[PDB]
């Protein structure tokens with residue numbers, strides 16, 4: 001039992017975070033970690049070796065950008081976990097991860113090992129009350145308000161088309177290609 | 183010759199009906215699989231029925 005679940009869309013390009021009932025995601029930031037390349041010589045300089053979201057957008061020239069997730073597959077989990085730690089920081093949402101349940105939206109036809117490792121982080125590191133993983137395609141139709149329909153979702157990481165009948169995705173007709181916005 | 187043609191068409195049509203029934207009438211009464219081309223997941227239906235009634239409303 002909890003107050004209000006937090007929806008977190010794990011997009012390849014930008015992470016969209018907000019509470020269930022909200023019309024728009026209140027907190028949207030790019031899904032990459034920026035580390036300062038240049039050496040600190042003077043005191044009272046920018047503190048920290050990690051910059052995420054608007055702090056990395058303002059001082060972009062200083063930072064080296066590394067994306068932890070490519071084609072919806074997390075290559076570096078240390079960076080991905082730190083970004084989910086930033087989701088609960090004072091900048092975005094500013095709430096306790098143990099207090100609110102989480103809804104994550106993963107790409108279709110992903111490996112099972114990703115969902116298994118993703119689940120471990122939010123139950124071990126963040127001690128979340130409850131976790132629900134959802135498909136990108138099924139949610140897109142719920143928003144539009146159609147139970148049956150083909151979702152041609154061309155994302156930053158991957159492009160895929162899922163034919164869905166009465167809210168059920170046909171696992172044999174799903175077609176995904178690595179070519180995307182990036 | 184009229185008998186020959188008429189009885190040949192009649193037997194031919196019965197042979198066509200056997201193929202037709204398999205694809206239309208026989209499948210129309212009971213499908214081999216649902217429109218999704220998957221077997222029913224009985225554990226998923228017990229929990230999904232509740233989820234799909236509110237998600238499809």
Ligand SMILES: Nc1ncnc2c1ncn2[C@@H]1O[C@H](COP(=O)(O)OP(=O)(O)O)[C@@H](O)[C@H]1O
Pocket residue numbers: 010011012013014154155156157158181182
């Ligand atoms: N105005 C635009 N015109 C064309 N491409 C755009 C535009 N805005 C964003 N994009 C592309 O779409 C990407 C955003 O996709 P994203 O929201 O991450 O999708 P998902 O989270 O579903 O994978 C950007 O990284 C960029 O490549």
